[PDB]
Amino acid sequence: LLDAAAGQSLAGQVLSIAEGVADLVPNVFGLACGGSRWGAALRASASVMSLSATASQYSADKISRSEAYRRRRQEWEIQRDNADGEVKQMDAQLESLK
Amino acid sequence: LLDAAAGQSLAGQVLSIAEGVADLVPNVFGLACGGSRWGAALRASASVMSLSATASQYSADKISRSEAYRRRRQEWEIQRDNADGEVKQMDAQLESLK
Amino acid sequence: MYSTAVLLNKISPTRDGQTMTLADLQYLSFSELRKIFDDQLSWGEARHLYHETIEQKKNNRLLEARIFTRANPQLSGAIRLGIERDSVSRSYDEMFGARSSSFVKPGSVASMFSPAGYLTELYREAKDLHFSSSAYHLDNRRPDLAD
Amino acid sequence: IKITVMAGSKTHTFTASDHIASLPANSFDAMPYTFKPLEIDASSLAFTNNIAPLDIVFETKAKDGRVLGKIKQTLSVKRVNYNPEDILFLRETHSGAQYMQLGVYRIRLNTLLASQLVSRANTGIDTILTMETQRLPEPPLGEGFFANFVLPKYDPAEHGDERWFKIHIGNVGGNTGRQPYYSGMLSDTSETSMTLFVPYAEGYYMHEGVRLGVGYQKITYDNTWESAFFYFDETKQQFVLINDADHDSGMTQQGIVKNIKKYKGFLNVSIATGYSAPMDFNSASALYYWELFYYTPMMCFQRLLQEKQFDEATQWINYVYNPAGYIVNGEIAPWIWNCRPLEETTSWNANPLDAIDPDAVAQNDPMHYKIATFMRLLDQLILRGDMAYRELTRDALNEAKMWYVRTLELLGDEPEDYGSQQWAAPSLSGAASQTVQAAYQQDLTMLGRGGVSKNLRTANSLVGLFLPEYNPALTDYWQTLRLRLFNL
Amino acid sequence: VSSAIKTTRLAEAIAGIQLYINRALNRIEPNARADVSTRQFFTDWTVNNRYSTWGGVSRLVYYPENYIDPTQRIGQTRMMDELLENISQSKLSRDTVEDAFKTYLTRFETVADLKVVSAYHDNVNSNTGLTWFVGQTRENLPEYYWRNVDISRMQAGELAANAWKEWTKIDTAVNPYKDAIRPVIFRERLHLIWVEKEEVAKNGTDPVETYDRFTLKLAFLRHDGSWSAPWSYDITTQVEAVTDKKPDTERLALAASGFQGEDTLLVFVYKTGKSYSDFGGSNKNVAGMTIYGDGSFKKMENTALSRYSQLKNTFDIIHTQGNDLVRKASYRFAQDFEVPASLNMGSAIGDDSLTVMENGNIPQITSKYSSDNLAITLHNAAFTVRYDGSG
Amino acid sequence: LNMGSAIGDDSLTVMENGNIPQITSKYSSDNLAITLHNAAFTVRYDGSGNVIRNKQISAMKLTGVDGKSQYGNAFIIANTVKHYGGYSDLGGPITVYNKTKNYIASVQGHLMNADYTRRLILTPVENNYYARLFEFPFSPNTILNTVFTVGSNKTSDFKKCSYAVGGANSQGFQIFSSYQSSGWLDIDTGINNTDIKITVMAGSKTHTFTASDHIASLPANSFDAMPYTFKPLEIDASSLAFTN
Amino acid sequence: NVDISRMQAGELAANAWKEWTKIDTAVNPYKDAIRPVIFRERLHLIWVEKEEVAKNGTDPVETYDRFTLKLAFLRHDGSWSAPWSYDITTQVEAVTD
Amino acid sequence: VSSAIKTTRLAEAIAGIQLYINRALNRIEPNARADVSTRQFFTDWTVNN
Amino acid sequence: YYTPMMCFQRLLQEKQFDEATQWINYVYNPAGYIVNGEIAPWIWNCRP
């Protein structure tokens, strides 16, 4: 799901750029004309920067939790190995006891 | 509450699309006419992508915290079993002592 | 774009006076089929016969599975209330007798999934990996395997 | 050194003597040959379904006779066809049904089930996942009528060596010949009854009306007045069966005709009046239908089971299967499985073995979904008993026994091994024999269409084949129940 | 080996044959039959080389129920994946599952209530190939989906359910005029083409006159499933011409056809009628555009317009018996027959591993149907012979 | 209006797909007219799943020795049947006695051995060959689902014979398989068209429509599905008790 | 909503009533022209909206009121759909003179 | 069962009737009355068992 | 070259041995490569 979130964040960069291009076209006509949003392109480039940062943060969280699960498994393996040694030690004590 | 947050994030997608449709219609009239927001539809599609990403992150947190509680309970089960063995072991030691 | 009946006719007979059937080509790869029948078949015809053979192979496998699934003695069974015997199931039993009901426990040599079954499949396909002229032929280096 | 092409019956050959642009340097290293443009008269190609093959061969042989290299290839030539009766078009009836038509055949494209689910959802979801909702009718695909056909029991004397049957359609469009319309298999125990939809348009039916006849091979009932004839009566404004019996005079598409004979092959043919067909679990909407009525309840059952919500899980799995039946209108329903495609065993996947997919196999034979659902119910019962067993109280132990006994009563008595001791041990080469494999596959292919068993019994000494194996998961259920009852 | 290790005769035979197969397939022992080593059994050697994995794939056909998972399945709908996420917690109330199911029903209604609006068949005839559809939602929102079906599977008008494909949502901000949106395939990938109508006025006129501007848009599906930024073209002159300056009272119609032989996209704009005459000259009811591989366009003249007249049988028409609209699927265009533009022969090994034939191909294949005979020309057919053994 | 389905007597027959697709109204003058269009339902011989379903219907479905049909005849069948003994549990001889033609139809699932001689034996003891009251050899030795032509009226003898035995040898005795009988039920499969009726009540008035008069097309007379579709039912609803 | 079939002699039990539920769909009706309605077996909300518009290309610029009818329905999960819109200006001017 | 396990007369009667109800509702014993098996007690058998 | 190798290493690091083999076979396979139903003459499937 976190990987999907990062992909969805990046999926809006193309649309944001297209919006800036579209809003550069004048939109009022007659004997009062104009209406272009001059900074529409600049806002679009600022938006793709924000989406890039958001996608990076989602991707970093995905990897961070993944490696946390891996180190958690490594601790479980040591616990398993300790318990296996416990059984072997006690089976040898049975030989001593008898 | 996290599940509610994810649902609310997705609940704004329909409204975002409708806003882009509504703002495509020209809004100034007379002998100087126009006023359509050309990139309104493109912005709406970009917005739902962002809302989709936010909902995905909220859902991921809900599931991650839920499984954390489950692994926490599994550790409690091992602790309970260890304590049960302690009592049984010490009751066997009492027979040896007497 | 071809007719499988005509293509089988173009290769018939299969050295035994019979109309070469699709089941007889189980059996050999597309490269084998193109090489052995390089004279009678074009590239498109070889592809058509190979594809039709595989589809016949899959359908026969499904038909056997359909019969065995309903003939399983384990499902009698409150689930037997919703099990119906097909007409093809009765025709199979008239031909093969008690075969459809001769289930074996896992771990028996007679099972189709037993190590003996795996060994049969390995031997069937690896038998012809070398020509009979070669000392590397399976039946030459180890003549005991065939018996 | 020649290039040869085959276009139907004509064969063109181009050799290095005549059609070489520039000969390459004569050496042991790479010798690239490039040819002049090859002009091919492709006018005798066998066009089957508007496509024809072109065979091209590159061959170079030394004077030894060795093939220095041979490459075979086939080219596909496709004929453009924009004839109106061969062009796909889309229509939408006033009832809301969308269908795509290619000549005679019409295929439904959409679904209208969503509107009828709203009223069901006004009550609980118990009303949505019912047999009644799964049998809801769909509007017809444009103008036409529904006709009921009944076919006889299989009779080798009348039908022939094989039990299959084909139904053909007659005077539609401009084609007067037989077009395939439906296919199936005769039953050896009872009759087979079907309801087909025949399309209609103004001027669409030819002289005497449409034909619907049945063929069997060794006979094909499409002589004069042998197929069923239908026409649309402009006066009564309804469809009429022309030849339900012998008639010295009757009205048809082209006015009155004289000698009308009853149809042959069918036991009975009639017109279903006001009939609407229930929704098809093999249509273009089959994926969404299966998810709504089977896949979703089983997913909710599994998740609740994994969280030990046993009572809530039972409610969800009872939407598809319940051994105690289903209460509809205050009565026990006659059907065994509440999921309609399972009760009717509706296949909706024609190529399950194209890839390794257990679900695809189960979609081809929904019988496996019956077993899978049945085993899931056994899993819940055993888990219920195990948790009750662990509470250690007398009431808990009695509850555990109840669950285990109910599980054992659903399974029944486990069977013995029947085929192991009668199995003759073959040699390794005998089991891998190609003749044994081919003989068995021949019987399976014949069985897939016919059922011929001349010299019925297969002479038990004629077997080196392996035998089916019991399901290890089911035998584990019996093994578990035996151990639990022993300890109790 | 030491005498301590034990085995069985069948187990040892399996081990021996497995070793022999590995040596033969990996070219370790010479004179291995290259034709036999390509059997389906040896292609799947990654799972047939072990008794455990071989048994797994063989039992799947007979006992698939041992591998069915009610939570994952090949083909699971996105809405089903959403439902699984909503009940992935550990505390599942009865009401919580009901609420999650109601969310699933909301998605189900949206997809179920789709209605097909246009179709494209990716072949020169209706005998083989895939038919692509575009759907529209009942809700008052410009949401569009797409799917396809393989009709080469068809037998007597019946189609297996697996021949169909899931509805997939288009996320690219499409706002088409009326129902003028349809799919098309060229450059071997799915494209979406539609027209949009906006209200504009001419600048510098004292009587301010507003007019409708018609824009043709074209976008394609990218490798990861996203949609590209659309190309836009002005087709106002063509729209007014074919509708007799009455776009409101007539039905503007759009048709797109892929001319793969020339790597071009043919776009037609026409007035919906009952029948259509040939294109160009006296017929002003049909206008056309040619879109090239890089997005440029060339408005069609009368000479080029007449070249595609037979495509009129794929246009939408009005039924004579009652004014019922009958849409028709557009088709890929070819002159008279479609023949592939090239064929690569590949390579082949000569006798005794002494010679090899290399780099065989026919770069150009053309067609010519004059009178009633078809001529096929193979240009620059070539191959190379060389003395070489395959390693 | 969707009627639904219903289970018949003795779990022998079922009624399916009953509904009225269209219902119209008309208030002309001061009387209300209700029309039920295309009312239909189907009757089919099918048990809801038991021994009665699989093996007794299939016994009746067999073609008679006089030639096919057997539908519309009277039968006597066992209420509950169970496997009792024998070498193996085959499908088990499930015998049905045809009263109107004096036939005995037996049904099996599998046979033990093709070469060994097999016949039918009906005996009230099971292990006593010399207590039998019926015995018929199989017309082919390798066949199930046949009919045997008792010849006389021996219903009383048939009711005496429990323990239907299908092994039936004298190579010793050699009981291959046998089944129990429990109780006995009498059924007639003949249907009268005047008894297939739809009846409606509107206050004090009662309308009755049977298959004899108001049927559009009569269905094929067979053991399988028989769908009846009626002509439009015109109902005079002017005596309804309108409460609130 | 309330179930009035429960009514006995004009008295209504409290459980026959239903909780107030908030509508979240951006409704801006003109005056009090908003009401519920049931068709297709689900709750719909229908209302009219008033906007101030002028006719293009007229030297005396004349403003007029534009009336739009909106219709939305409650979906399965409790959300509201995008409203259908129709122009009813001619009907409004006719009936209100 | 072994002689080690104990019970009471009422407890054994409850266990016996529960076993009979399960067999009757699940179509394991023939001639079960389908009309009686739809009583409110048996519909709520998920909590009355 | 670089992308199939990267996928091989990641699958190998996660012990997905069968999937890793499929990716590394895009560049090297000792058993050859099937092209047009025949074993290809080249030893390495990566052209450079």
Side-chain angles (χ1 to χ4, degrees), chain A residues 64-80:
Chain A
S64 270
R65 312 212 174 132
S66 172
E67 299 307 298
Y69 292 153
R70 178 200 307 277
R71 310 301 225 173
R72 177 244 267 148
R73 197 193 191 200
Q74 298 169 348
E75 269 165 348
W76 281 344
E77 175 184 5
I78 298 167
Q79 287 293 84
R80 196 273 320 275

Side-chain angles (χ1 to χ4, degrees), chain B residues 27-72:
Chain B
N27 73 334
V28 315
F29 319 88
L31 55 102
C33 64
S36 295
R37 186 147 74 72
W38 296 130
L42 290 160
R43 183 195 291 182
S45 296
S47 288
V48 313
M49 295 286 76
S50 288
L51 293 169
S52 271
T54 303
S56 287
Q57 174 259 358
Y58 284 151
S59 275
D61 277 26
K62 180 197 67 180
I63 304 178
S64 265
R65 294 231 258 274
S66 169
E67 296 301 300
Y69 291 153
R70 177 198 311 279
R71 309 302 225 176
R72 180 245 263 145

Side-chain angles (χ1 to χ4, degrees), chain G residues 6-84:
Chain G
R6 248 56 179 279
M7 219 180 82
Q8 307 181 346
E11 202 155 76
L12 213 52
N15 62 296
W17 285 95
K18 174 153 151 30
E19 211 177 308
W20 279 117
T21 308
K22 176 148 177 298
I23 306 173
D24 275 308
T25 187
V27 174
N28 279 265
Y30 160 78
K31 216 105 76 174
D32 60 337
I34 174 168
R35 71 178 26 250
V37 65
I38 285 199
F39 94 115
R40 312 276 285 186
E41 276 104 1
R42 85 208 328 180
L43 175 71
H44 288 57
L45 188 77
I46 184 165
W47 69 100
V48 312
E49 297 187 358
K50 188 196 77 164
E51 317 141 74
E52 178 182 336
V53 191
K55 211 189 170 262
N56 272 339
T58 57
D59 211 288
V61 176
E62 286 288 332
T63 61
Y64 70 87
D65 287 336
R66 181 168 77 189
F67 290 80
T68 307
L69 180 80
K70 279 181 173 10
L71 173 65
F73 63 88
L74 188 57
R75 295 162 46 183
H76 272 123
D77 64 351
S79 71
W80 288 88
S81 68
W84 284 289

Side-chain angles (χ1 to χ4, degrees), chain C residues 4-143:
Chain C
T4 85
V6 191
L7 298 184
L8 284 184
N9 270 13
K10 294 237 284 287
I11 319 181
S12 302
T14 177
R15 211 198 172 181
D16 219 8
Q18 285 276 33
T19 314
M20 161 104 71
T21 171
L22 215 52
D24 279 347
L25 306 175
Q26 200 76 343
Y27 149 58
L28 78 185
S29 67
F30 168 78
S31 178
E32 293 196 73
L33 200 141
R34 212 205 53 77
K35 201 172 309 311
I36 295 181
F37 307 143
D38 184 53
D39 212 61
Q40 305 91 302
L41 297 177
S42 74
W43 198 79
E45 293 169 332
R47 272 229 307 170
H48 189 83
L49 273 181
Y50 177 71
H51 173 78
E52 280 290 351
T53 292
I54 300 302
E55 287 289 348
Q56 192 73 73
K57 187 183 192 287
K58 290 175 180 167
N59 285 350
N60 286 339
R61 174 77 64 183
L62 286 180
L63 172 58
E64 181 171 47
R66 180 158 314 102
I67 281 170
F68 283 163
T69 290
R70 291 141 221 265
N72 192 345
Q74 294 171 313
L75 311 166
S76 56
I79 181 170
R80 189 62 92 198
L81 290 185
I83 300 174
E84 208 31 67
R85 287 261 280 159
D86 304 358
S87 307
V88 68
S89 271
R90 293 177 202 107
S91 287
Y92 186 98
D93 283 338
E94 298 178 28
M95 193 159 31
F96 290 110
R99 169 169 168 86
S100 87
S101 294
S102 300
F103 277 68
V104 311
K105 276 179 67 52
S108 167
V109 73
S111 163
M112 40 170 48
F113 311 123
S114 85
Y118 181 43
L119 180 63
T120 295
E121 275 308 314
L122 288 175
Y123 184 83
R124 188 214 310 287
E125 310 280 17
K127 184 177 48 204
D128 303 315
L129 274 176
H130 279 94
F131 289 106
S132 320
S133 307
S134 192
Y136 290 115
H137 192 214
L138 188 55
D139 287 314
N140 287 351
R141 60 214 287 173
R142 286 204 51 185

Side-chain angles (χ1 to χ4, degrees), chain D residues 132 135 137 148 150 153-155 189-193 267-276 328-329 331-336 456-457 460, chain F residues 2-7 14-15 17 21-22 38 47-49 61-63 68 114-115 142 216-225 227 229:
Chain D
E132 180 216 48
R135 285 199 65 79
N148 234 306
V150 181
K153 200 177 309 189
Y154 173 63
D155 192 346
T189 67
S190 40
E191 315 149 356
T192 77
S193 174
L267 255 49
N268 183 20
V269 173
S270 57
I271 282 191
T273 322
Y275 172 79
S276 309
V328 174
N329 291 323
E331 289 280 22
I332 300 282
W335 44 86
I336 295 286
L456 302 92
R457 29 195 168 163
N460 37 56
Chain F
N2 176 76
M3 303 290 176
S5 305
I7 300 174
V14 67
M15 177 167 153
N17 300 319
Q22 283 119 306
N38 285 311
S48 293
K61 258 154 149 153
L62 296 186
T63 50
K68 325 185 87 70
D115 310 354
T142 62
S217 179
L218 273 187
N221 219 28
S222 86
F223 267 127
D224 277 43
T229 299

Side-chain angles (χ1 to χ4, degrees), chain A residues 34-81:
Chain A
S36 294
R37 193 149 71 72
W38 296 131
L42 291 163
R43 181 191 292 186
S45 296
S47 284
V48 308
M49 290 298 96
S50 286
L51 295 171
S52 265
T54 301
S56 288
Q57 173 249 311
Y58 288 153
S59 278
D61 274 28
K62 182 195 68 179
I63 306 179
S64 270
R65 312 212 174 132
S66 172
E67 299 307 298
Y69 292 153
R70 178 200 307 277
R71 310 301 225 173
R72 177 244 267 148
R73 197 193 191 200
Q74 298 169 348
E75 269 165 348
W76 281 344
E77 175 184 5
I78 298 167
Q79 287 293 84
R80 196 273 320 275
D81 288 356

Side-chain angles (χ1 to χ4, degrees), chain D residues 88-152:
Chain D
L88 288 160
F89 49 86
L90 324 180
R91 309 192 60 174
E92 185 171 348
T93 79
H94 204 241
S95 304
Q98 286 191 319
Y99 60 97
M100 144 193 76
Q101 177 163 18
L102 174 65
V104 191
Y105 315 106
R106 293 184 179 168
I107 293 170
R108 170 179 268 103
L109 284 183
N110 74 326
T111 172
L112 301 176
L113 176 60
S115 40
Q116 272 153 322
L117 297 186
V118 177
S119 80
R120 311 297 213 291
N122 277 333
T123 323
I125 82 178
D126 320 61
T127 323
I128 298 172
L129 305 185
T130 64
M131 174 77 65
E132 180 216 48
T133 308
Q134 301 172 48
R135 285 199 65 79
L136 283 190
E138 300 224 61
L141 296 177
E143 280 183 312
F145 68 100
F146 288 91
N148 234 306
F149 297 71
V150 181
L151 280 90

